[PDB]
């Protein structure tokens, strides 16, 4: 029920709180590779 | 020696750290760059036996410094997150050597001056966030030729027009809110593919809404509020089969709000307050639906609360603009 286009209006908000992870792969994984993605459209994986 | 190049880059950057409130760079010492806080290593893309610095993430470290040319040595970096720091000045041109750049987030810093055009040089760029800085001047139209998924420009000091090239963008989200953009929304807006969310809040745009907006059938969020648009809502807006949030408040729209629009299937919040609408369908009336939120404050509607006075309304309502 949150939209990243609207959240972009809060200067402190970022798509992902897990330091070092791609905004396109904010999911706990055994490893922390910045090259790893998976989500196609940020609006869809933001929810 | 590849990690030596990263070491020099990061030590040149730490020299430029004037204030580091959370002592984030405290452990930035010695040649083991991979153990530096905020530095993220990974196997090389073309060789998993080689170790490279692939990511930088200092989000929320509140660091006052600038980005020195030497950061151009971080040639394996594809992720650069420095949201909510106090990095000042300009983006060094040398960052064009970061050819794997994919997601670049300098939101909420102290950057200034012309659009950071070094971003146009990155062939793999997907996510560009420069919101909440002091970038200004014209927007490079070629930015919509890159295959960006996300373009955040809001809360800067950009000026002049929305480029005619906007229809080329493949972005799922674009924000222009809180700049000083002027002129019309281009008719090419209908050609944007993949578009889900577009935000224009608080600019100096005007003219009529182009009917081509109705082709954006995957849009969920269309916010045009706090501009200077005129004319009637185009009837083509019934093509917004997916829109959930639609905000036209604080403009100079006139005319009728029909159930062509108010009965769109996913539409749950429709704000059209502070305009000069002189009629609305019954299904547009706030308080009328338990599923759909409406807001019609300060228009020119009979038998509704908090409307504009008849004195203020008749001059405008009786001279509607011919969208032509």
Curated annotation (Swiss-Prot), chain A:
Domain of life: Eukaryota
Subcellular location: Secreted
GO MF, any single term: hormone activity
GO cellular component terms given for this protein: apoplast
Post-translational modification (record): Proteolytically cleaved, probably by S1P, a subtilisin-like serine protease (subtilase).
GO biological process: calcium-mediated signaling; cell-cell signaling; regulation of pollen tube growth
Annotated keywords: Disulfide bond, Hormone, Secreted, Signal
Disulfide pattern: 16-26, 39-45
Function: Cell signaling peptide that may regulate plant stress, growth, and development. Mediates a rapid alkalinization of extracellular space by mediating a transient increase in the cytoplasmic Ca(2+) concentration leading to a calcium-dependent signaling events through a cell surface receptor and a concomitant activation of some intracellular mitogen-activated protein kinases.
Family: Belongs to the plant rapid alkalinization factor (RALF) family.
Protein name: Protein RALF-like 4
UniProt source species: Arabidopsis thaliana (Mouse-ear cress)
Gene, per the UniProt record: RALFL4
Span of the entire protein shown here: 61 to 107 of 110
Swiss-Prot record, chain B:
UniProt superkingdom: Eukaryota
Residues with glycosylation annotation: 204, 218, 269
Chain segments carrying region Disordered: 286-311
Role: Modulates cell morphogenesis by regulating cell wall formation and assembly, and/or growth polarization.
Residues of the full protein shown: 70 to 393 of 956
LRR repeat ranges, renumbered to this chain: 1-15, 50-74, 75-97, 99-122, 123-146, 148-169, 171-192, 193-216, 218-240, 241-263
Segments of skewed composition (Polar residues): 286-308
Entry PTM: Hydroxylated on proline residues in the S-P-P-P-P repeat. O-glycosylated on hydroxyprolines.
Expression across tissues: Expressed in flowers, stamen, pollen, and pollinated carpels.
Protein known as: Pollen-specific leucine-rich repeat extensin-like protein 1
Cellular compartment(s): Secreted, Cell wall
């Amino acid at each position: 029920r949150r939209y990243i286009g609207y959240d972009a209006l809060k200067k402190n908000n970022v798509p992902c709180s897990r330091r070092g992870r791609s905004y396109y792969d904010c999911k706990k994984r055994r490893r922390n590779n910045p090259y790893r993605r998976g989500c196609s459209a940020i609006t869809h994986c933001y929810r | 020696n590849r990690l030596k190049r990263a070491y020099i880059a990061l030590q040149a950057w730490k020299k430029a750290f004037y204030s580091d409130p959370f002592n984030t760079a405290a452990n930035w010492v010695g040649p083991d760059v991979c153990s530096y806080k905020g530095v993220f290593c990974a196997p090389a893309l073309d060789d998993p036996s080689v170790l490279v610095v692939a990511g930088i993430d200092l989000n929320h470290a509140d660091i006052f410094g600038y980005l020195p040319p030497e950061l151009g040595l971080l040639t394996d970096v594809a992720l650069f997150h420095v949201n909510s720091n106090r990095f000042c000045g300009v983006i060094p041109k040398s960052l064009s050597k970061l050819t794997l750049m994919y997601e670049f987030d300098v939101s909420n810093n102290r950057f200034v001056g012309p659009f950071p055009t070094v971003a146009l040089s990155w062939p793999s760029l997907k996510f560009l966030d420069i919101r909440y800085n002091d970038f200004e001047g014209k927007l490079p139209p070629e930015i919509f030729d890159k295959d960006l998924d996300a373009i955040f420009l809001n809360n800067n000091r950009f000026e002049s027009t929305i480029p005619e090239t906007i229809g080329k963008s493949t972005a799922s989200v674009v924000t222009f809110a809180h700049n000083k953009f002027s002129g019309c929304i281009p008719k090419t807006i209908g050609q944007m593919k993949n578009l889900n969310e577009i935000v224009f809040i608080g600019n100096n745009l005007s003219g009529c809404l182009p009917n081509e907006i109705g082709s954006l059938n995957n849009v969920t969020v269309f916010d045009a509020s706090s501009n200077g648009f005129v004319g009637s809502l185009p009837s083509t807006l019934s093509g917004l089969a997916n829109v959930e949030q639609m905000d036209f408040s604080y403009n100079k729209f006139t005319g009728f709000v029909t159930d062509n629009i108010c009965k769109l299937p996913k539409l749950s919040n429709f704000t059209f307050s502070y305009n000069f609408f002189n009629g609305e369908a019954q299904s547009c009336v706030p308080g009328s639906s338990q599923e759909k939120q409406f807001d019609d404050t300060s228009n020119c509607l009979q038998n509704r609360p908090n409307q504009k006075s008849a004195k203020e309304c008749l001059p405008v309502v009786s001279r509607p603009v011919d969208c032509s």
